[PDB]
Write a protein that binds this DNA or RNA. Structure first.
Lengths: 73, 225, 421, 116, 52, 134, 341
RNA sequence: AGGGAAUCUGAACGAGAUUCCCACUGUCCCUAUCUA
RNA sequence: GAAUGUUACCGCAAUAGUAAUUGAACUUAGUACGAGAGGAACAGUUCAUUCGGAUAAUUGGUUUUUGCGGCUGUCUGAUCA
């Protein structure tokens, strides 16, 4: 049972398989930037917590999201 | 004060009971001799609670607690939680803990001042043991044995660890707990020392297969007589 | 194997042994064949019987051979102890006769089956089968003496004591009927007779005791004046890692001269020279100092009528054998008495409650009446726990009346506004 | 006795109905029927499927934040059983049910406005 | 294992049946016959409803 | 031997020839069942184990120290829908079992994942080496 | 198979008759020995278990129970049997002078075509000071070692579309044959309730004709099902009442509900009268007439002595899947619907 | 814009054969239901 | 299934078959008995194994209610069907 931050996931398909919990932490200024998006709303918050309940369509909701976060970097 | 008994012909006392300074918790077996074993030695002074957790007799290695509090896992029903509160005095608090792990007797090894925990426990419980039990919490390993409860007997007077504990680990760990530690056994060379005996500041109850050379070591380190 | 041998399958007296093995081949195998069958089924019938009786005797013989301890391969004490109690040559002659007889029976069975595949009539085949089992019977009839010996040795080795040559031992010696029987009588729980004659005890009686959290075993002995009973004592002194407690009777009792005890002590001196001897007294006084001339001896004066000095002898023996922040305690516990089991005046436990109420598995323990409440009239708790799809315990808090009235204020703040039209 | 919530529907799971599923991580997934259990096995998003309550909360077809809904809390610190403190709950639960039904009816009216 | 028709078990169960084991049934029977006697009076009241 | 108190019927999910995972930190990763201790006897029926039943099982993928010897194995995870007396039917993710001596004493020092409620009740020392129950 | 349950043939009727009766004590009060109803229903119960010595002492157990519908049985006669070297022999039966439409229906196979002229001359035979009826009742009391009660079921109060009630014979285990025949005299045209025969924590043996499966193919081919089976030792969990609402209410649940599920049982109606909730499964299907006898003998173990503390009754939908106990809980969870507003 | 690896046979082979490793399945444990 | 007036209901029981099975768990016990190592049994209660008779409350299975829904193709000149 593994736990990492979302920011650790961004900087790296291969990540999502071994993982169970990505964590939301508001104290980082980086997450405050990621909060102010058209993403990170509408179903995305619960998708973070339960990674093995998802399926293919909700994996692509994150794999599209990572590239949005990489372009901000 | 070293009593030697059994539950349904079983030497593992700590599995089927949890005994602290202010209370004793017992499983409802068919034979009442285990309840009467404590009622002989403790009387009507500290309350002995006929109790179950999740409909399991295996209470002592499922719960955590000291003189101040009591912790039960997620699987504890609201009827059992109602029953424990009814039976206990109001000086002792009760809280159900939601976790990855449910065997609290294997995870929280403690006394009235200190506590050892599993290194992989969540932060929420780490800040809940600190509040409900009011004790110092340490993510400490006993010689690579990740479960701290079954492989460490502990009190305010002293403690007892499994014989595979290193001398370096004895000195390092007793520096944390601030009590003298001796590597010993229970029930004729059983390595499980936490579930092999229940202990507090004035009583040590072992299983009926604990030999006298081991029993003298128990009496010595917990400083009874 | 190890210390003792009670677990031996019994030894039939060679006449009954025949009545076991031969009757079993009559009961367990098919027994009825016509002469009008095929020759192949007649052959296979009698072959099956010769072979089955073969396995029968061999099974019984193998049980004897594997059962009895291999005398010269066990342990030097036991090799010699059995040699004293039983004629060791004859013990090996007897087991050699069984090992011989088993190989004989095997040879007979293998012979007559090979001879049996050439039978031409039912009569010839019958005569060959009768020849086979009759021959086996003759072999077993030649075993009436060694098996009669093997039953007696089985019975008497089954009752022999288990000494451990690796635990801390202490031999108890002296002249026959000195008073050493009273010593082991008053040191442990072992019934040894103190009958007023010479050879009351006939073997090595054992007594276990515990001191300084350790297992000890004191071995009582018959005594030394040579006999099988007498040599049993001497070899127990010789082969055991022990200390010897030679006892002396400085009195009119025993019926032997103290000078003869001196002569015997200095004569048997060589084989207990390595064992660190203790001597206990239960011109004339000078010849006790003649006993003191031995390198390793100590002298003590004791009385068996008093229970302190008998314990002190033990203490010195065991000592020779080893060298060879504040806790929370409630005052309700501190003020509480101890539980005396033979007291007419004490509290009744739940154990006595269930007996008085009748039975162990029939009494249901009331979980109620044992928990603390504000009013004991509501002790017999019902507690609903569920009302209409939603469980009570989730809704259950203190100050729910005040919290409800807060929601009642939130009613009237939406009542006049006009949400319900 | 406990009446639970379905991990898919959030419908009432009565004792002796459906299946509890336990992961290697060890958490409980209770279900009310094999419709929900097979829907979970297929690895679906509940909040996408319309017949669940998880959808109706986030899409706002039903109410999410309310003072009546804050009393169905998973409650932990236990009470010493007062006859009065239970008799008050029996009438409290029947009261809060009435108010919650009237509020939800008002929510349906406030949602279904502009259709007439 | 002892059979269903094992003599000693039948005798041990007869030791039971002369104690508590019959007495509870002989109290239950009295409570059943009582309510049966109570069932006459109700029907007799519904006789007197028409008789009124 | 070892089992505490009575043992009640739950459904049978692990027959002879079934590979379950190993859960203790002893060295083995998987376990191959060869015989079930204390089973019924029909004609043509294979011996089928369940949760909390001591089986005789061999290591297939693990340390060579744990191999060379067929040893007792107590099943801690079943993954076939058994029934509890508290209403619910439940099942796990995978089949798992832990290795022990004939006495019921554990070789490993900790058991990973959930341990079944029935198994932890029957076997005391499994519950001693348990991290998670249920 | 089992060679006792042979010949494996179709029964004489759906109402199987009770083969043996509980003994007799000639000091006990007069009480019925067997009862009948109509088996239709099955449901789930939870209860805390006060069975000491078990692995579930002071724990909770879920279990399957069956609901037989039992309308108040009505007494319409009495039979007296003499003890012969040939068995028993009925010498005199006596009836109730004015019987229901249901039983006069039982006397015909075609009900509508008949002039309904059943007991016309028998009722006219009564029409005086008695004289002959009291003569036949003297005839029963004088002789006749055992006395059995003729009853019938209240078929109309049951949702069944049959209209035709079943006659039965029930012996009396109340001593002094005088009190038997005079209990009967006190009970002509009257009815007998369920709880005047049974109560809670009582073992019974429900007898039923076992669910016909028709033709089937030494392990032989032929008939499977429709056999008259006696099953013994089913504990009565609850005796119920029709007029009393909150039958589904326990000591714990206490919600005003009937044990009847939402939209009733499958293939059978609600419950509108008295019932027995028996543990386990009674033979036969739904809509099937069962005859409940009581135990034959003193059958006390701890499976017969213990008190049942029922905790909850499942009244969820058996037709479909179960999610809601009441209709009130369906539209409480659902919110409000289209056709509502 | 079904695998893979060896070997026996005439380095890949050829629907050659055998053995093992991995995956799969009602062949079976243990049958159950539906349609033609 | 004709027949023994018809017809209906309630019955009796000659005769024939028949069924239950084994294991251990708690007290009784760490007592009897035992140098020790060990270590019982009756009465009380609790489960399980095999076998049989059943039954479908729930779980799982199952679907020409082909019940509803989705996909692929195909026709009404296109939507919907």
């Amino acid at each position: 049972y593994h736990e990492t931050s979302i920011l650790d996931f961004v900087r790296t398909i291969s990540m999502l398989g071994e993982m169970n919990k990505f964590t939301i932490d508001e104290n980082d200024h980086e997450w405050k930037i990621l909060k102010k998006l058209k993403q990170t709303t509408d179903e995305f918050r619960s998708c973070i917590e339960d990674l093995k309940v998802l399926g293919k369509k909700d994996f692509k909701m994150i794999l599209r999201w990572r590239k949005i976060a990489r372009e901000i970097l | 004060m070293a009593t030697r008994t059994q539950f349904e012909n079983s030497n593992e006392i700590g599995v089927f009971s949890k005994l602290t300074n202010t209370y004793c918790l017992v499983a409802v077996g068919g034979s009442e001799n285990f309840y009467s074993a404590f009622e002989a030695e403790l009387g009507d002074a500290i309350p002995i609670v006929h109790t179950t957790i999740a409909g399991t007799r295996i209470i002592g290695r499922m719960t955590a607690g000291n003189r101040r509090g009591l912790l039960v896992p997620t699987q504890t029903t609201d009827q059992e939680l109602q029953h424990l509160r009814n039976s206990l005095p109001d000086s002792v608090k009760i809280q159900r803990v939601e976790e990855r792990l449910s065997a609290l007797g294997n995870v929280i090894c403690c006394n009235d001042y200190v506590a050892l925990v599993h290194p992989d426990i969540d932060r929420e419980t780490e800040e809940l043991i600190s509040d409900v039990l009011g004790v110092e919490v340490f993510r400490q390993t006993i010689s690579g044995n990740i479960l701290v409860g079954s492989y460490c007997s502990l009190s305010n007077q002293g403690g007892l660890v499994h014989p595979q504990t290193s001398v370096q680990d004895q000195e390092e760990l007793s520096s944390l707990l601030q009590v003298p530690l001796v590597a010993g056994t229970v029930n004729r060379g059983s390595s499980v020392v936490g579930a092999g005996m229940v202990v507090n500041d004035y009583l040590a109850v072992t299983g009926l297969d604990t030999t006298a050379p081991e029993l003298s070591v128990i009496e010595s380190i917990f400083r009874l007589q | 194997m190890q210390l003792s041998w009670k677990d031996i399958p019994t030894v039939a007296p060679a006449n009954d042994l025949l009545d076991i093995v031969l009757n079993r081949t009559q009961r367990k195998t098919p027994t009825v064949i016509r002469p009008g069958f095929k020759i192949t089924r007649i052959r296979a019938f009698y072959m099956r019987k010769v072979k089955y009786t073969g396995e029968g005797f061999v099974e019984k013989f193998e049980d004897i051979l594997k059962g009895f301890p291999n005398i010269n391969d066990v342990h030097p004490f036991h090799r010699d102890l059995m040699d004293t109690l039983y004629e060791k040559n004859h013990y090996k002659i007897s087991l050699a006769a069984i090992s011989r007889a088993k190989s004989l029976v095997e040879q007979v069975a293998r012979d007559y089956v090979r001879l049996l595949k050439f039978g031409q009539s039912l009569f010839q085949c019958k005569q060959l089968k009768r020849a086979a089992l009759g021959r086996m019977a003759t072999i077993v009839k030649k075993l009436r003496d060694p098996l009669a010996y093997l039953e007696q040795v089985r019975q008497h080795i089954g009752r022999l004591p288990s000494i451990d040559p690796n635990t801390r031992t202490l031999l108890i010696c002296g002249y026959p009927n000195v008073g050493k029987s009273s010593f082991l009588r008053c040191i442990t729980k072992s019934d040894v007779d103190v009958q007023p004659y010479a050879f009351t005890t006939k073997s090595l009686y054992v007594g276990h005791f515990d001191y300084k959290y350790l297992r000890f075993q004191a071995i009582d002995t018959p005594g030394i004046l040579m006999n099988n009973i007498e040599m049993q004592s001497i070899y127990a002194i010789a082969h055991l890692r022990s200390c010897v407690l030679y006892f002396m009777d400085l009195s009119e009792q025993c019926g032997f001269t103290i000078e003869a005890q001196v002569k015997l002590f200095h004569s048997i001196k060589p084989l207990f020279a390595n064992k660190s001897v203790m001597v206990v007294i239960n011109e004339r006084a000078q010849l006790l100092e003649s006993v003191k001339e031995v390198p390793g001896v100590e002298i003590m004066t004791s009385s068996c009528q008093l229970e302190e000095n008998v314990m002190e002898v033990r203490n010195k023996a065991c000592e020779k054998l080893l060298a060879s922040r504040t806790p929370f305690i409630p005052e309700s516990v501190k003020n509480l008495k101890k539980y005396d089991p033979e007291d007419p005046n004490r509290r009744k436990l739940a154990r006595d409650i269930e007996a008085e109420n009748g039975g162990a598995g029939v009494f249901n323990v009331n979980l109620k009446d044992k928990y603390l409440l504000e009013d004991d009239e509501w002790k017999n708790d019902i507690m609903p726990e569920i009302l209409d799809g939603k469980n009570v315990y989730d809704f259950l808090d203190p100050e729910i009346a005040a919290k409800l009235q807060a929601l009642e204020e939130e009613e009237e703040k939406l009542e006049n506004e006009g949400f319900y039209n | 006795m406990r009446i639970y919530q379905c991990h898919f529907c959030s419908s009432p799971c009565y004792p002796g109905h459906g299946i509890m599923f336990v992961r290697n991580d060890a958490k409980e997934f209770r279900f009310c029927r094999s419709k929900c259990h097979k829907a979970f096995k297929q690895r679906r998003n509940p909040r996408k499927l319309k017949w669940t309550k998880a959808f109706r909360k986030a899409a706002g077809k039903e109410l999410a934040v309310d003072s009546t809904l804050t009393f169905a809390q998973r409650r932990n610190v236990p009470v010493r059983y007062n006859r009065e403190l239970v008799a008050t709950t029996l009438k409290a639960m029947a009261r809060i049910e009435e108010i919650r039904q009237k509020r939800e009816r008002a929510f349906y009216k406030n949602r279904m406005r502009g259709n007439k | 294992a002892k059979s269903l028709r094992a003599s000693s078990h039948l005798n041990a169960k007869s030791v039971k049946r002369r104690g508590v084991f019959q007495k509870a049934v002989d109290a239950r029977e009295q409570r059943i016959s009582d309510k049966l006697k109570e069932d006459l009076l109700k029907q007799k009241l519904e006789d007197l409803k028409k008789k009124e | 031997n070892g089992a505490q108190g009575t043992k009640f019927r739950i459904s049978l999910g692990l027959p002879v020839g079934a590979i379950m995972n190993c859960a203790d930190n002893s060295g083995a990763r998987n376990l191959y069942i060869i015989a079930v201790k204390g089973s019924g006897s029909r004609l043509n029926r294979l011996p089928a184990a369940s949760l909390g039943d001591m089986v005789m099982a061999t290591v297939k993928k693990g340390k060579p120290e744990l191999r060379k010897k067929v040893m007792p194995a107590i099943v801690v995870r079943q993954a076939k829908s058994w029934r509890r007396r508290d209403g619910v039917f439940l099942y796990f993710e995978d089949n798992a079992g832990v290795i022990a001596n004939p006495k019921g004493e554990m070789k490993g020092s900790a058991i990973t994942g959930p341990v079944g409620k029935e198994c932890a009740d029957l076997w005391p020392r499994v519950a001693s080496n348990s991290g998670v129950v249920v | 198979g089992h060679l006792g349950f042979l010949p494996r043939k179709r029964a004489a009727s759906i109402r199987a008759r009770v083969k043996a009766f509980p003994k007799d004590d000639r000091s006990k009060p007069v009480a019925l020995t067997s009862f009948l109803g109509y088996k239709a229903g099955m449901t789930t119960i939870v209860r805390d278990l006060d069975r000491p010595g078990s692995k579930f002492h002071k724990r909770e157990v879920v279990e399957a129970v069956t609901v037989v519908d039992t309308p108040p049985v009505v007494v319409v006669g009495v039979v007296g049997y003499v003890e012969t070297p040939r068995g028993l022999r009925s010498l005199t039966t006596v009836w109730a002078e004015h019987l229901s439409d249901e039983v006069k229906r039982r006397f015909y196979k075609n009900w509508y075509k008949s002039k309904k002229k059943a007991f016309t001359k028998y009722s006219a035979k009564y029409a005086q000071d008695g004289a002959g009826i009291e003569r036949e009742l003297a005839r029963i009391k004088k002789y006749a070692s055992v006395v059995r009660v003729l009853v019938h079921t209240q078929i109309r109060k049951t949702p069944l579309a049959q209209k035709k009630a079943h006659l039965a014979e029930i012996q009396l285990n109340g001593g002094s044959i005088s009190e038997k025949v005079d209990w009967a005299r006190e009970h002509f045209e009257k009815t007998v309730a369920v709880d005047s025969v049974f109560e809670q924590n009582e073992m019974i043996d429900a007898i039923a004709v076992t669910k016909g499966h028709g033709f089937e193919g030494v392990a032989r081919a032929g008939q499977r099902g429709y056999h008259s089976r006696t099953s013994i030792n089913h504990k009565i969990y609850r005796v119920g009442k029709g007029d009393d609402e909150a039958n589904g209410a326990t000591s714990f649940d206490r919600t005003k509900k009937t044990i009847t599920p939402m939209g009733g049982f499958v293939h059978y109606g609600e419950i509108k009268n008295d019932f027995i909730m028996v543990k386990g499964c009674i033979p036969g299907n739904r809509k099937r007439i069962v005859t409940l006898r009581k135990s034959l003998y003193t059958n006390t173990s701890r499976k017969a002595l213990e008190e049942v503390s029922l905790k909850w009754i499942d009244t969820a939908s058996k037709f479909g899947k179960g999610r809601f106990q009441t209709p009130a809980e369906k539209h409480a969870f659902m919110g409000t619907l289209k056709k509502d507003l």
